[PDB]
Amino acid sequence: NFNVSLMEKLKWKIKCIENKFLNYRLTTNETVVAETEYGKVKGVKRLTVYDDSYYSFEGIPYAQPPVGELRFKAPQRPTPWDGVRDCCNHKDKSVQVDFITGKVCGSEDCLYLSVYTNNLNPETKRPVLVYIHGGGFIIGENHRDMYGPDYFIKKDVVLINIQYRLGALGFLSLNSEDLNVPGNAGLKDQVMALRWIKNNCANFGGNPDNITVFGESAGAASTHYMMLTEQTRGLFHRGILMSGNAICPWANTQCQHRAFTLAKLAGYKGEDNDKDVLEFLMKAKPQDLIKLEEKVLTLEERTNKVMFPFGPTVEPYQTADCVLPKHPREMVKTAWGNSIPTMMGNTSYEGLFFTSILKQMPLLVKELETCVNFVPSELADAERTAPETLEMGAKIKKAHVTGETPTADNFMDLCSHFYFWFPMHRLLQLRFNHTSGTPVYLYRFDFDSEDLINPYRIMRSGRGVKGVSHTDELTYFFWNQLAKRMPKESREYKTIERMTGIWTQFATTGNPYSNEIEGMENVSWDPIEKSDEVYKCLNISDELKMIDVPEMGKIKQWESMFEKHRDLF
């Protein structure tokens, strides 16, 4: 659906080539060996364009390769090895459609994590930051051409980037208990990765009693799931949810009937029987399955804003490794993670991400005539024609439609709320009713540049588009192959320092404020309180300023849809 131009596909190909050379220039001859529970790993010292250095261990397995009869199943612990495992190169990413070339890439053998640090033997054990990548549960990787640790390793932390199964391979779900495919395999991968980290971070200079998990978009929903599930109780100590959480409408789906659909797409002939469907899918070539996934959702499902066919789901029966036994809103009520310091935030124009989609499908803007398609599914009737549904839609329309007829920008603004701000609000309010009183801080990422970018901008055809879109903040956390060395006085460089600085500060203390961070001098960053009528956030632009969340007025209008159904809010 996001279709990259020929011109950009070519610029990408040359960038990939140029990056092979840069990566070579930045690899040193110093290798090093570290211990793990499962055996020795050999890493390599790497340099950055800022002339910093760090130790790099990639391709550390945290589970058995989920191949053969392990396909679709929960991850199994990895087998120990004698000798030295080479971790001087990255492994394959999870099978997925390449977000730029449109071809399938990756491998089923993808359950790896990577560990980075500027010092393997620090005087004191360091905060460990664990990044879970986004990508709608269908794309993404921990490759350094996408998520390089180059900025974070300026700081005295251990940074770990994990992979997890994506798409149908990670999120197939079948009702039949005998089959042992309850769903959420990809989240169970994350759980098993977190367990490896808890039990191994000390070997890399990390403090197992100060672990922070963070992620953006699907990675933020993942981080939230990791804070909700009983499987991980007490495993880590801070969470950061960047542009997403588990109660976002895109973050979960009841996809139990879609395995049959995928099989039928792939040529299955027979009855809709879980067992027969599974055995067909078990023998299919993985790339074939992943290639067809885009065709799974029905017209009605897409109209109703179901975004992905396979994703996190409520597991239909309980198993020892069950991650999601109930709907996430119900899980919030009991979540161990409600009681750890938490930071959440969004960009200042999230929905700008949809620019190119509106270009391809301009009729989409007509949905704002009544806005019924954006009424939360729990409240809307099946056909979205009921008088109450039109009334709800009218509330949304008044919040976002500027003039007599809706515009593209109106649609994109509405999207920021539907997909991000409203679920953030619902989460905060729900959590406030079930927490030990531990602090939540909000940020709003509001720094716009075209001088330094990341690959999502190419994926969304957002080159030269002004405004701070979904994903734009990643540029200031992670090196990627489109980046370049910025002057220390550049606003971009300062923003990298600020973002990695605040994240590291929060990781260390559970409080994101520090007067040691340039620009944070007249800043008093207080956490949100249950009694607060209006949220305050740290707005991050060229300056750091505490403000009332500008989106609050609209958020309350969305909330008003639930006036006669408060139990569902």
Side-chain angles (χ1 to χ4, degrees), residues 1-12 14-81 83-122 124-317 319-358 361-465 467-487 489-493 495-521 523-529 531-569:
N1 216 332
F2 283 109
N3 190 93
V4 184
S5 73
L6 248 70
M7 180 271 299
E8 291 287 353
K9 283 170 175 190
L10 185 89
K11 281 195 180 192
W12 182 251
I14 83 111
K15 269 306 188 181
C16 291
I17 299 178
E18 292 179 350
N19 191 71
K20 108 141 253 291
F21 287 94
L22 174 60
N23 184 70
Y24 177 73
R25 277 181 277 138
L26 294 173
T27 308
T28 78
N29 296 318
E30 185 184 338
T31 59
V32 67
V33 178
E35 303 289 333
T36 81
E37 284 182 319
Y38 298 89
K40 294 156 202 303
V41 296
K42 183 179 79 162
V44 61
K45 178 176 175 193
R46 300 186 184 283
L47 308 182
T48 78
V49 298
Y50 297 101
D51 301 307
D52 295 306
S53 64
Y54 62 96
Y55 301 88
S56 177
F57 301 81
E58 305 171 282
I60 305 180
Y62 62 74
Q64 280 282 111
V67 303
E69 279 141 313
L70 291 177
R71 174 191 287 177
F72 304 124
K73 312 297 194 310
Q76 293 294 331
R77 307 156 345 206
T79 66
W81 58 89
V84 183
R85 170 158 224 133
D86 193 311
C87 295
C88 295
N89 283 100
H90 65 75
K91 291 290 214 180
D92 294 312
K93 64 182 73 179
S94 181
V95 189
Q96 64 190 261
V97 176
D98 187 289
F99 68 123
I100 288 176
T101 77
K103 300 307 219 305
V104 179
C105 62
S107 157
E108 288 194 276
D109 180 10
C110 62
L111 301 186
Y112 297 98
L113 57 75
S114 295
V115 180
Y116 312 106
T117 176
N118 70 26
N119 188 338
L120 278 164
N121 292 280
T124 61
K125 255 44 190 300
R126 296 174 163 184
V128 178
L129 289 69
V130 178
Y131 185 70
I132 308 181
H133 69 79
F137 302 101
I138 62 160
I139 66 169
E141 60 289 295
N142 68 5
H143 295 182
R144 300 178 295 102
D145 56 15
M146 298 299 309
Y147 298 99
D150 304 53
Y151 306 159
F152 265 112
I153 57 82
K154 281 182 174 292
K155 298 291 189 157
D156 292 339
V157 299
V158 176
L159 177 59
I160 304 177
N161 292 66
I162 73 167
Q163 289 184 168
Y164 57 92
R165 278 172 282 175
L166 302 174
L169 252 10
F171 294 96
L172 206 85
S173 176
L174 300 173
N175 289 332
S176 177
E177 193 165 355
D178 287 331
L179 273 22
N180 196 38
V181 182
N184 301 327
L187 289 181
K188 293 159 185 189
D189 294 336
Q190 296 175 8
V191 167
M192 189 163 286
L194 252 20
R195 291 175 178 159
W196 184 98
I197 292 164
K198 185 69 161 182
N199 295 311
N200 293 269
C201 63
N203 302 112
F204 300 87
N207 181 3
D209 296 313
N210 198 24
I211 298 168
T212 294
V213 178
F214 70 128
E216 186 262 349
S217 195
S222 292
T223 296
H224 194 204
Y225 284 130
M226 294 302 105
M227 299 170 69
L228 295 178
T229 182
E230 288 295 334
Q231 297 291 349
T232 53
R233 176 173 285 270
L235 222 49
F236 56 98
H237 314 87
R238 295 87 167 77
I240 312 179
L241 278 21
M242 310 170 64
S243 296
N245 62 59
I247 63 193
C248 295
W250 50 262
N252 54 81
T253 186
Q254 293 313 110
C255 52
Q256 290 72 30
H257 183 57
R258 302 190 183 121
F260 171 71
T261 304
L262 177 60
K264 293 298 292 182
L265 254 3
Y268 170 69
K269 298 172 183 70
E271 300 299 341
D272 180 9
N273 177 273
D274 283 351
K275 183 167 117 68
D276 293 310
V277 166
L278 180 53
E279 46 190 39
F280 180 89
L281 295 174
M282 289 292 281
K283 72 183 189 200
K285 295 190 194 181
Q287 61 268 25
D288 293 343
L289 262 27
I290 293 302
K291 188 190 330 289
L292 294 167
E293 204 171 297
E294 62 169 35
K295 297 185 140 67
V296 169
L297 291 171
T298 63
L299 170 53
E300 162 135 351
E301 280 168 332
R302 26 227 347 167
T303 299
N304 292 330
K305 308 298 180 176
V306 178
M307 309 308 310
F308 309 103
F310 302 97
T313 197
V314 179
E315 304 182 40
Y317 56 92
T319 58
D321 298 308
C322 179
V323 169
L324 304 186
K326 295 180 164 293
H327 287 271
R329 64 180 283 102
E330 303 301 321
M331 292 181 68
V332 171
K333 295 174 176 167
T334 274
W336 73 265
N338 290 344
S339 297
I340 65 176
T342 302
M343 178 159 61
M344 308 182 183
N346 301 288
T347 72
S348 57
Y349 201 172
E350 292 276 355
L352 185 65
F353 195 74
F354 296 93
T355 287
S356 72
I357 294 193
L358 281 173
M361 303 167 65
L363 283 81
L364 246 27
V365 174
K366 293 198 79 172
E367 287 190 326
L368 269 59
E369 232 85 87
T370 66
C371 291
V372 170
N373 290 351
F374 286 103
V375 177
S377 292
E378 327 83 88
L379 296 183
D381 64 295
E383 285 186 322
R384 292 185 187 254
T385 56
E388 48 268 62
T389 302
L390 272 46
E391 288 181 3
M392 290 161 191
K395 291 181 179 99
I396 300 180
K397 188 183 179 171
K398 261 102 98 311
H400 300 286
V401 174
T402 264
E404 289 290 275
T405 75
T407 63
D409 279 290
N410 291 171
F411 186 94
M412 292 185 295
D413 182 50
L414 191 166
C415 284
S416 301
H417 288 260
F418 180 73
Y419 293 108
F420 304 102
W421 289 102
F422 189 45
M424 186 195 73
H425 178 52
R426 297 176 78 173
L427 173 58
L428 260 7
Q429 294 305 310
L430 184 61
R431 172 182 171 286
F432 273 138
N433 284 116
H434 315 83
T435 175
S436 64
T438 95
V440 183
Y441 301 83
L442 301 184
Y443 68 88
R444 188 175 181 264
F445 189 80
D446 188 29
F447 174 92
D448 190 16
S449 173
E450 198 73 33
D451 284 359
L452 186 70
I453 62 166
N454 76 65
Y456 272 117
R457 188 178 294 259
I458 304 317
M459 174 201 160
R460 67 178 164 98
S461 297
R463 220 201 266 278
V465 180
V468 187
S469 171
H470 192 55
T471 80
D472 281 2
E473 83 278 34
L474 290 172
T475 298
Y476 310 93
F477 289 96
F478 297 102
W479 173 266
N480 68 80
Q481 69 169 29
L482 304 181
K484 67 185 68 92
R485 194 209 248 265
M486 301 302 292
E489 345 77 51
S490 62
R491 50 193 295 266
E492 292 83 11
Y493 185 84
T495 299
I496 294 171
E497 288 188 313
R498 286 162 167 180
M499 299 306 82
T500 52
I502 292 166
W503 262 234
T504 292
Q505 178 59 38
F506 186 70
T508 302
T509 73
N511 182 337
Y513 177 82
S514 174
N515 51 42
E516 210 160 340
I517 293 175
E518 113 216 277
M520 243 178 174
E521 290 82 20
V523 166
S524 189
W525 193 352
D526 286 323
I528 308 300
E529 300 296 341
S531 56
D532 286 346
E533 295 298 347
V534 179
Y535 298 141
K536 300 197 184 160
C537 59
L538 176 69
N539 194 73
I540 303 162
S541 58
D542 280 279
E543 60 181 23
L544 306 180
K545 186 183 182 164
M546 293 298 306
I547 64 176
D548 281 0
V549 167
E551 286 77 13
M552 199 75 202
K554 288 162 179 174
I555 287 168
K556 300 241 71 43
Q557 292 177 73
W558 281 73
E559 176 174 0
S560 76
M561 288 186 293
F562 287 82
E563 274 180 5
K564 306 193 190 67
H565 306 280
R566 288 296 296 182
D567 64 304
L568 301 176
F569 169 71

